[PDB]
Amino acid sequence: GIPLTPLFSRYKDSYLLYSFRLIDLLRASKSTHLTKLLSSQATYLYHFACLMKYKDIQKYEVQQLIEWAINASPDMDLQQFRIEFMDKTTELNLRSCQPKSFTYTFTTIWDTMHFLSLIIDDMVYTRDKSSLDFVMQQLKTMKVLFYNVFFILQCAMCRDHYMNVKGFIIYHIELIEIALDKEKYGTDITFVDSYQQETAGADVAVVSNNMLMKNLMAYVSMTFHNHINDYKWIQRNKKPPAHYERMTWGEYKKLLNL
Amino acid sequence: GIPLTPLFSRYKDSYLLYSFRLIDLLRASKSTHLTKLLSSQATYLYHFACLMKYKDIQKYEVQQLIEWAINASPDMDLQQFRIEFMDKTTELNLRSCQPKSFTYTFTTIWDTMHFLSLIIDDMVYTRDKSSLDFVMQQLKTMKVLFYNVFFILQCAMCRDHYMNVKGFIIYHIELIEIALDKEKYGTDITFVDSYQQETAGADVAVVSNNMLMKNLMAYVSMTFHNHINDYKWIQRNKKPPAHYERMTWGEYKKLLNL
Ligand SMILES: Cc1cc2nc3c(=O)[nH]c(=O)nc-3n(C[C@H](O)[C@H](O)[C@H](O)COP(=O)(O)OP(=O)(O)OC[C@H]3O[C@@H](n4cnc5c(N)ncnc54)[C@H](O)[C@@H]3O)c2cc1C
Numbered sequence: 001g002i003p004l005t006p007l008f009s010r011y012k013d014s015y016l017l018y019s020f021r022l023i024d025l026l027r028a029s030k031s032t033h034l035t036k037l038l039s040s041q042a043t044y045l046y047h048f049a050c051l052m053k054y055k056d057i058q059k060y061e062v063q064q065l066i067e068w069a070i071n072a073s074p075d076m077d078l079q080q081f082r083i084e085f086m087d088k089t090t091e092l093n094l095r096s097c098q099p100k101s102f103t104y105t106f107t108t109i110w111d112t113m114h115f116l117s118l119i120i121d122d123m124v125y126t127r128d129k130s131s132l133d134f135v136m137q138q139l140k141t142m143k144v145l146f147y148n149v150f151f152i153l154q155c156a157m158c159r160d161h162y163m164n165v166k167g168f169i170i171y172h173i174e175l176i177e178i179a180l181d182k183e184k185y186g187t188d189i190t191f192v193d194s195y196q197q198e199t200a201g202a203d204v205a206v207v208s209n210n211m212l213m214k215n216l217m218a219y220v221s222m223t224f225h226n227h228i229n230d231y232k233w234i235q236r237n238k239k240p241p242a243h244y245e246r247m248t249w250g251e252y253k254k255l256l257n258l
Numbered sequence: 259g260i261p262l263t264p265l266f267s268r269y270k271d272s273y274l275l276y277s278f279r280l281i282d283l284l285r286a287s288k289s290t291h292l293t294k295l296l297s298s299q300a301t302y303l304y305h306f307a308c309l310m311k312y313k314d315i316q317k318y319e320v321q322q323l324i325e326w327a328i329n330a331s332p333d334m335d336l337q338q339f340r341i342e343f344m345d346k347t348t349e350l351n352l353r354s355c356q357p358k359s360f361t362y363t364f365t366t367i368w369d370t371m372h373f374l375s376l377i378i379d380d381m382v383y384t385r386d387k388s389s390l391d392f393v394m395q396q397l398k399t400m401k402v403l404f405y406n407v408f409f410i411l412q413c414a415m416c417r418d419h420y421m422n423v424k425g426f427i428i429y430h431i432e433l434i435e436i437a438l439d440k441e442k443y444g445t446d447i448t449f450v451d452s453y454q455q456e457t458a459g460a461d462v463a464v465v466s467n468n469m470l471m472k473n474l475m476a477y478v479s480m481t482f483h484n485h486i487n488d489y490k491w492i493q494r495n496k497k498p499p500a501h502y503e504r505m506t507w508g509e510y511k512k513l514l515n516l
């Protein structure tokens with residue numbers, strides 16, 4: 001139930017490009033351990049792409065795609081892998097998982113993280129349908145995706161920094177788990193409009209309060225994204241550029257029609 | 259400039275007990291790598307104990323204490339190490355670093371984390387004195403302390419969970435670094451009373467706003483502590499006990515006279 005907007009369309013495409021570049025790494029994997037980690041990450045990523053598009057995951061078709069990527073020739077170049085990827089996904093009836101744009105940049109990875117955040121918010125708000133158990137399983141998978149992020153591009157500094165602060169995101173996913181658990185035991189979730197209301201609601205001695213900010217992960221990922229960009233100037237020991245600009249929640253909500 | 263209260267007194271003692279138990283591990287270290295990690299952690303811990311007590315770190319005396327612990331007999335039992343520790347610290351004029359209580363529990367580690375949080379808040383509010391550079395260095399050390407936490411007691415589940423969410427704490431330390439950097443470049447820090455005000459202040463497109471919650475780390479560590487205890491019921495797949503009780507900011511501020 002995510003609003004259709006130009007930005008969300010870009011997020012979807014970026015997410016598919018990221019997943020495509022991730023499976024392209026399988027044939028070049030330097031170890032069984034890495035192949036396993038990459039294959040699992042890819043399986044989960046495509047699962048969420050299909051959940052939104054097909055309102056279900058094509059566990060079978062996705063597995064066939066991943067199996068194909070694992071066995072693809074390592075001598076093959078990216079252009080050839082692209083071509084064979086398009087043919088394979090067409091054959092597997094996964095045309096909706098094909099990227100339209102192939103320009104890979106940091107925006108691609110950020111877009112991917114923001115896309116997953118919107119999925120989390122949507123799966124929770126519409127939990128009326130699958131089941132609290134299904135959602136809980138999905139959140140566990142989301143934590144694995146965020147605990148493990150493959151940059152594909154090279155940036156050791158980014159990797160080290162993310163290692164240090166990724167817990168900020170994971171912490172909020174756990175807040176959702178707690179809210180769902182409270183609902184299982186009798187207290188329905190009350191959605192609020194601001195992060196401030198959620199913070200105030202959490203400042204109690206009892207567990208009978210169950211307030212959760214609507215669009216929480218969208219806000220959390222936006223805030224995290226701003227933080228990384230605010231901190232890079234400290235990493236470079238420099239004053240931020242005169243035209244450095246941060247994203248505001250009001251602007252972000254408008255862009256995604258939240 | 260931390261208020262003297264019964265709770266803070268307990269925090270101080272717990273912090274010293276934690277540090278004592280950490281250096282007791284040196285003589286039993288299974289590798290040079292571990293000895294280095296433990297020695298560095300211990301050096302930083304004692305540095306902050308002395309900073310508060312002696313308004314400076316006894317880099318020399320602390321180094322002598324650590325060197326002593328590294329060379330202590332591995333066959334020695336904890337009671338004997340205690341005795342020799344008391345004699346060594348007396349000799350090194352570090353009597354103020356001697357624990358009064360020796361009962362080690364999870365409370366000991368939590369107290370240690372809350373103590374460091376109060377130190378961070380105090381060093382920042384009174385930055386008028388050392389220098390922005392000194393404080394920045396201290397914060398870097400604090401991040402290392404929180405990125406690395408030795409439980410001493412055994413709890414693999416705790417370790418794994420902390421690994422996943424410690425970024426929530428580190429994220430807020432980086433927020434302080436950003437605030438100090440903004441001050442270096444011309445914008446003084448404006449302290450606010452609530453986390454909600456800090457959140458609202460951060461929701462801007464410019465970098466000219468520099469609002470920081472007073473007692474931020476005290477609030478962050480309290481919130482984190484509540485979160486870990488809220489989540490353990492999910493880990494155990496059980497409803498929280500009927501008498502489970504959480505800490506509130508109002509109660510916490512009163513206990514520490516913040
Ligand atoms: C997980 C991760 C960690 C990183 N760690 C580091 C690091 O430690 N150091 C470092 O130097 N670089 C790091 N980077 C890269 C850095 O965040 C920027 O992507 C890069 O410097 C390029 O900046 P940019 O000016 O092109 O903007 P980008 O941030 O790349 O912009 C990408 C897109 O996101 C939009 N956008 C900007 N801010 C927000 C927001 N808050 N919420 C939503 N959309 C927004 C932009 O409008 C644009 O369309 C990291 C990237 C990722 C994905």
Ligand SMILES: Cc1cc2nc3c(=O)[nH]c(=O)nc-3n(C[C@H](O)[C@H](O)[C@H](O)COP(=O)(O)OP(=O)(O)OC[C@H]3O[C@@H](n4cnc5c(N)ncnc54)[C@H](O)[C@@H]3O)c2cc1C
Pocket residue numbers: 364365367368372415416417419420479480481482483484486487490493504505
């Ligand atoms: C970093 C860390 C991670 C841990 N991870 C796990 C885990 O994943 N799973 C698990 O089962 N256990 C975990 N634990 C242990 C758990 O947090 C408890 O300490 C333990 O279960 C004992 O609970 P208790 O009821 O004795 O209260 P404790 O939380 O141990 O109480 C210690 C003291 O802190 C006070 N206090 C309580 N809440 C707060 C608060 N929010 N702020 C400040 N003071 C407060 C109490 O009043 C008491 O004096 C972890 C401990 C630490 C230090």
